[PDB]
Design a protein around this ligand. Sequence first.
Ligand SMILES: *[C@@H]1O[C@H](CO)[C@@H](O[C@@H]2O[C@H](CO)[C@@H](O)[C@H](O)[C@H]2NC(C)=O)[C@H](O)[C@H]1NC(C)=O
Ligand SMILES: *[C@@H]1O[C@H](CO)[C@@H](O[C@@H]2O[C@H](CO)[C@@H](O)[C@H](O)[C@H]2NC(C)=O)[C@H](O)[C@H]1NC(C)=O
Ligand code: NAG
Ligand code: NAG
Length: 326
Amino acid sequence: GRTCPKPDDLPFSTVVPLKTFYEPGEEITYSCKPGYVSRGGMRKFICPLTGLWPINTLKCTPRVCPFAGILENGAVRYTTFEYPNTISFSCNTGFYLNGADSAKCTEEGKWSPELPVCAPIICPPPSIPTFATLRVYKPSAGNNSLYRDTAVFECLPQHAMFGNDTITCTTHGNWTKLPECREVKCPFPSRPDNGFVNYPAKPTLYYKDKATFGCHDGYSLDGPEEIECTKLGNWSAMPSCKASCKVPVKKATVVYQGERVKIQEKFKNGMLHGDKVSFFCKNKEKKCSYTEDAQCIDGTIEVPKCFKEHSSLAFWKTDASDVKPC
Ligand SMILES: *[C@@H]1O[C@H](CO)[C@@H](O[C@@H]2O[C@H](CO)[C@@H](O)[C@H](O)[C@H]2NC(C)=O)[C@H](O)[C@H]1NC(C)=O
Ligand SMILES: *[C@@H]1O[C@H](CO)[C@@H](O[C@@H]2O[C@H](CO)[C@@H](O)[C@H](O)[C@H]2NC(C)=O)[C@H](O)[C@H]1NC(C)=O
Ligand SMILES: *[C@@H]1O[C@H](CO)[C@@H](O)[C@H](O)[C@H]1NC(C)=O
Ligand SMILES: *[C@@H]1O[C@H](CO)[C@@H](O)[C@H](O)[C@H]1NC(C)=O
């Protein structure tokens, strides 16, 4: 033969000068592409008189960047550390990435942008809001605090806290929002009719100050015995003394709080304001018993009209409460 044909294309290389045929004596050069290297450098060949290119031992492989699989206190994502490839980084809880979160292996076999390290998230000591004291706080990293650490505030006596009392060290190295500590006063509480109120003897009453109520005999509170001044400047509650009821019949079996009682027994000293019971009424038609409710309301309770109280003298008839349910 008289010319060499087009040279073969090796995998990650280029041939210069690339023609489709060569005269004997012409030279070509194989070079590995940028980012690749091969054993033995580049290969030059001269087209021989036979027109047959010789054997080519060129095997181009990617440069490998230095090992980068271990990020202290974090995690690298990689297939392999070869020239085309990029790796990415993240940090374990409590740490942040000091540097870029990915890097590439360059043509020159170096990492760019250059590998990061993980560092602990820290916060400076928190500031104390302007009427508050620092209840719980201990630094965990020199003078500073670590991520998810907390501090707890306590307002000064007679001051009410608006907002959560605990702050946390966040990822941004600042704390969550601080609370405020305002002074709050309450009016004096009303003495209730047929009762009395008690509260500390001082010219003015503040947040968390407490007042207690009582009722004269024949009356009970319709609210809580103790109340306190809330953060909003009013009182926890304001109960009255409501009137009890004389028991409204002499002998009857009633439902009280889901269970049968003898009303003359359970309520021998009257019924308190609010007490509900259920009286037993006789459905004369179907010969069975049903109940209907009745409540003591400030000294009044109204017995259902269907209720018939048999004097125990008339023992020849049966109480509605002894008749089978409907
Ligand atoms: C803690 O610091 C970060 C600053 O990086 C604050 O977050 C920024 O808040 C403003 C307004 O709330 C936003 O417009 C920004 O987009 C936020 N930036 C980021 C990166 O989140 C945060 O408000 C600060 N916390 C406190 C309690 O001051
Ligand atoms: C103490 O005063 C506040 C102020 O009005 C009462 O809060 C109100 O509660 C009801 C609930 O819907 C509404 O009138 C308003 O939404 C609330 N107002 C404000 C400003 O929050 C509170 O209920 C009062 N508490 C007592 C025990 O009296
Ligand atoms: C802590 O704070 C004091 C000043 O209050 C300072 O002298 C000391 O060096 C600090 N220590 C650290 C570990 O930052
Ligand atoms: C304050 O924040 C803590 C911690 O996140 C949480 O339990 C709650 O939302 C708040 N605690 C209260 C309101 O007592």
